[model samples]
Target: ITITLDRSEQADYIYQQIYQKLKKEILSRNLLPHSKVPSKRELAENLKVSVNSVNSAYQQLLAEGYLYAIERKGFFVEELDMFSAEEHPPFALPDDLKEIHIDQSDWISFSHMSSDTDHFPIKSWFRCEQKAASRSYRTLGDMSHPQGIYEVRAAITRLISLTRGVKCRPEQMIIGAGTQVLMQLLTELLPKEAVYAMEEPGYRRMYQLLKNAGKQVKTIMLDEKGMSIAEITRQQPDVLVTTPSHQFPSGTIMPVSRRIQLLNWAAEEPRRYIIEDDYDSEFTYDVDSIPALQSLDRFQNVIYMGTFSKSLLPGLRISYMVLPPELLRAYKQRGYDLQTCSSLTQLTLQEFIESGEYQKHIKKMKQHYKEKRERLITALEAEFSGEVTVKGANAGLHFVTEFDTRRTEQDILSHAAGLQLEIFGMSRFNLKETGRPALIIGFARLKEEDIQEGVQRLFKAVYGHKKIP
Candidate 1:
């Protein structure tokens, strides 16, 4: 048996190489069943390796029943009925399998879901993370509580209470990886047969999630004050998922009267509930930030969700939800306990918030985003003049823009695609069609310097170099 062993820097251990080669030889029938293998000493000498190396490889083969030994004779191959190597060739990826490439480096995106992390406090975060790691020795050894560590929950409780006027105990909070994950868990906690009502042209991902979970979802259209209460009453869904602080896409803030009515609607039935997605409530450009819908939820019918994705960083993947007592009890009774977020991150966030760094970060980002929003609006107005109208700019990272043009949604989108620009049409979010052309322009992800150029590209896309007249 002439076995070759690889000794290069990139090669595996000599014993492993020998074992694999020998096994291949046996399986390939290069060595017939019951054929005698060379003695360890002889093979070692032939390969110029120590006898122990050959013994190690041979011992493994013997243990695996690939070779057997006699007291006085050398090792021999075992008679096996497994498929021979001749029947099957080595595996390789097919040549026709195309690799998909997505090149967005040149594209200026107006994505509402993204955040600008150019000014993130990396050093502060690193310091907090180091401290958290040192202090989390005990937690590192075991699974965290399903509701998350108490310290982090307590920190979040205090932060939300101060900022959004949320009322809750730390015990009511469930820290999760993201809103989607928490929503999935919420679905399981609620009645399986419950029907959900979503705002038309609302957070479409939530709509898709509910539908994919096999839950009945109704799309209720929005009015000036937000989701129409009359339409919700007609739908009679068991749960109403809303972004009441600043309505997504349209940027409609639910008036106090509407909020009261919505709460009353939830209180009307035992099974009825509301999921308030308080996403991007921290950066309102006009007036003070709006109080969360959960703050006004007297009947405890609201499930409040918040995330660090907007205020801090999106890649962090730490989101949390506050469950009312009834749902909390249901969660406990059902034993749906699993800590999905990293314990280290949770502890680091606790440190960040407790040390006052989180608040400072939010304050800085609010000013930054406010400026970006203003720049975007100014550029839009300059490019389109009186032919365009912008709304929903008072709050959140994005707003709605309506254009007085004859171009269709597809025409505008295709033109933008040709120019390597990324923007969303109002039709992308809506269930029902509006008469005019509108776009959802998000300013958070676009750099301040790119704002003017982006708007010019968009105007060109709409009118094709023709002056806005």
Candidate 2:
């Protein structure tokens, strides 16, 4: 019988080709079971290949039970019960299944959660990583402390103390992959019956997280000064999660009076605690930087959380939280001991902070974001004319802009989507409807030109083909 061999340059080795071809022939029943195959020498000569290659292929087939051998007889196909290929069809997705299509090309996203990577100090970070690698070689094989490396925790203690006015010992600090992870750990450590409260139109992820954890979560609406203390008292949740420095989406900075009042509320109850999520507090534009809620906390009621995601890369996934003395004890008592973040990353971060690179980077980014925010506001004013009113523009990466248009939120969103633009409406964050058409526009990720073009697109989305005067 003639057997075709692949003679292309890219084909497998002669033995592999022969083995595969013979196996296929046997499986397909081209060569019937128990059929005698040609001798190695005969097959090799026919194929114009070395006898050794044929012998190797025959040996493999024999070992795999595809072929049987006799002392004085040539190789023969092994008898086996084989099912028809119809039983096992190639896998495919359902005909009705369709993937959601997002046009990424020419897409300008006004995402408040994202950071601009263009200004990141890659060389400095690389240098710190290299140094950390060499220094941490010995400890890389073993697991680090559950809270995190001592050096990194110590560095964080100093950094936050000077910047955000946070008070806590390195031992009280727990380094985690992200804020969500640490928040999860807190859920485990805190009392199971504890009720959690969050801002009404605040960080939705955290709200969902608490709800998923099976904790009783209540949403407290915010006033001009931030989360209403009166509502907070009325709810009387055991845990109060808030963004005091820059109240997310709304950009309401909790004033010193409100902070004191909230702290007093937490102090009144033994189990009451505040999870101060100081995210994006590093980049403020129009106002002087405010101290974190934890700094003003006298009763050790604030659980301060900070992250490099804003000042540094979000992909880095380095976030930390300072637990109060009582909760610190609870954390230890519960035997919650395992480091979630990479030891190498923690070590590198220590070097980054200790070497003053982190501080310098933060300073540089503050100015960079400030300029972007200014340009975005100016572009919005020029494009929308006197039709838009801006709020929450004093600090943080994003601000709330209310537009004077009769268009529904869905209408504006659909128009923006048609142009391959991504924009978030303020209603997205609100737990209750506000009726007004407001947008939460982030400026940190966009360049000056992108900001200008994005504003023009946004104008079209709101006004629909109206020419800017």
Candidate 3:
């Protein structure tokens, strides 16, 4: 049988294949320098190749002085010149691209890669791509619009309106790589260098992004209600960045009255900006995602940032912003410099939206994730008893766990690691280092079986006891 490059069509054809395999085995140390080579029958059977092929390949090795044999014994590996590089691998990672140095020696990052994966709608997308290629006989090129392609922006506009009551045209949604990039674009357009107040226990990524741009950051605490507007009014920051629709880590939904008040405040303060990042608004296990504050604003102060990293799988690397009309000109001048997402992704995602596949996927995954999340919550309740209380409104992916202040973060993480359960430590997201001991446990990644075990591990981690088996 002829062996082709096809993944699984034929077994073997060439004696050369046998020689290469044996040499690889030798070099890889599968066969030691002094180890005797396998017998012809054994190797031939093992490789599922004909004995003649193996024998022919072995004869070439003997002729080449790589192998020697006694009269009655089998072939043996002979010593050869050590011309190849020494096989001592590095003990540490190569010192490449290690620029940002920080102390995360004990920090457990919760939101990093909860659902960024390859579980794409591959078959459906392949069919769409084939159709796109078949329908178009035009030259293939780049996606070069500043606001975004008509189809993509239309999809995004429809998405926000349908989900968040956001009423804007395709011109309003500026497509970018992620939420952070969208944040950068707004900074360039508006007065972001002035004081910017972020949520107290906010998303660290957002905090770091704004901070990296040299914007002054202040903490706005959350009480039983959503964002403490009184706190913002007292501080009078130039920009207010908030995740009102299911606040980050804490998971509380801002009340409608509070949202109205925030908009009125933004309207009153001329030249001020309100950046509302709807990071993970889709994962509300109970209620619908809260409508964006931008939807209610007559003034163009609210800059809306949304990311598909949660609602859609993160591999797409797509996020968007519903910009105010006033910022359009300045945003466009600097928008193109940031670069659009991968043409393949934007196009594929556009089709996903057009075909109603995105909504369908979200519905299916929502049901799946909610069930998983419920399992997690139930496990947490059973495990924690009453010493710990789970916080945040029933929206967003990450649910916070607040433990006693006496429990050390190190002990919690150490115990969690022993049971092979990974958790994001609470202190990682604390902006002002409040004396709160919390764990931002994201249920999006853990399997249902793993969730129960993970909660049990966490129980052991948080307290020196096993509550769940």
Candidate 4:
């Protein structure tokens, strides 16, 4: 059979585009089970791509059981009758993932995953890139260490220790493109069959990422001091993932006492480990942010993770993980084949860190977000007043505001959308017993002048049917 796919930017890779086309055809029963598929060379020539791309796609399909190779004849579609979902809806898209069609120019996206671009030091970053390039073409051109280049790792070590109170060595650091890659690598390095316990109303993306990586993910319902350690121990997960510094969506900071309990729990078992995601910990208001849970781990059970996406530009895609000594050894034993980030990026980030631009950028972002945080809070207060209560406002890029109304979170989102105010609901982050009807308002990228207008639009959406007061 011949294969066809349009070249598109969104497809990203040639092989992935080809694979999607083939898989879609197979899933729709257009290609019957045991149907003869075109040879890699034939398909590559047909698609006008290099043969290697088609071969790679075929190999991936074989690995995923979507196709099988007969020794002499080439690839064939696998029997998928038992797995076919042609007649049924594949699954309901999660509430948070539903597409919202709106006027892009007019809509203020409060849930955007970005920092303030208005203050991004593009020229400073460019200087760092030039410096990194001038260091040596040979050093930056070669494949980086599977764990990341030593310079970047070393710089990360110093920065995390000084800023987040995370004590780690260069050897313990594993740099990758994003936290999702780090999560995938962790699944490979750790026990394959082990279960992972995550916080309820935690970062849904993390929970979904681990689950998609072929692990049993259990949700431990959280309380005021972040996730319930008792439930974590009860679940008996081999790995407990948390955002102790400032929990996601819910925005609860785990206290030192609860941190100790989690460490104690990890100490209870040999295989146990803790993943402390110090995401958005750089922007806490009112008080200095709490030291990371990794700082409190005397037993070496905490695997520390942090990302620059929240503090810096999302386009950089730089995230890091600090594995415990044992996990580090395990990763090394795997032959270090997975160098998941670009060597150029690692070197440039090394330069960025060494020049202290990262520190300066963070400091500037902290002050920037602090003012924006106040602006959002002030606008919300003026509009909703006592009708709503805000939580987690003192930390992170976003906060949760619960309204004392019986309306569903979706209702608020729909109404907000109707008024051209793009919003995210808190329920999508919850797996069960959502606890309260709340909205997640992210103010990082929202402009200062637009804050009141956005808040007024939301106010009209939620309360316009009644008196303004």
User: Could you say which candidate leads in TM-score?
Assistant: 1
Instruction: Evaluate model 1: give its TM-score.
Output: 0.89
Model 3: per-residue lDDT, tens digit, 1-469? 2222223448554677677666766666666666688788877777777889789989988897667887886899876555578688767576764665765333332343557233456687677666655553241455456666667688888888888888887887887888777777777777645788988778788788888899889999988677888998998898888888877767778888888889889888687888888877776667776678888888888888888877666565688888777888676666336456765566667777778887887787777777767777787788777767788776567778788646688777777665556777878778876446788878665555566666666777777666566
Task: List CA RMSD, all candidates.
Answer: 3.7, 4.8, 11.8, 9.9
Q: Can you tell me which runs of candidate 1 are displaced by over 4 Å?
A: 7-10, 32-39, 59-106, 137-141, 334-336, 431-435, 464-469
Prediction 3 global C-alpha lDDT: 0.74
Please give, for residues 30-123, the per-residue lDDT of candidate 1 as tens digits: 8899999999899988999999989999999999999999999799999988665386655766764556477767788887878888978989
Model 4 misplaced regions, further than 4 Å:
1-103, 432-435, 464-469
TM-score of each: 0.89, 0.81, 0.73, 0.76
Decoy 4 TM-score against native = 0.76
**Per-candidate total of colliding backbone pairs:** 0, 0, 1, 0
- The predicted structure with the larger lDDT, 1 or 4, is 1
Q: Candidates 1 and 3: which is better by TM-score? A: 1
Model 2 — which ten-residue stretch has the worst lDDT? 427-436
Judging by lDDT against the true structure, name the best candidate.
Answer: 1
Clashing pairs in 3: 251-393
lDDT of 3 at 271: 79
Q: Model 2 segments beyond 4 Å from truth?
A: 1-105, 138-143, 333-338, 466-469
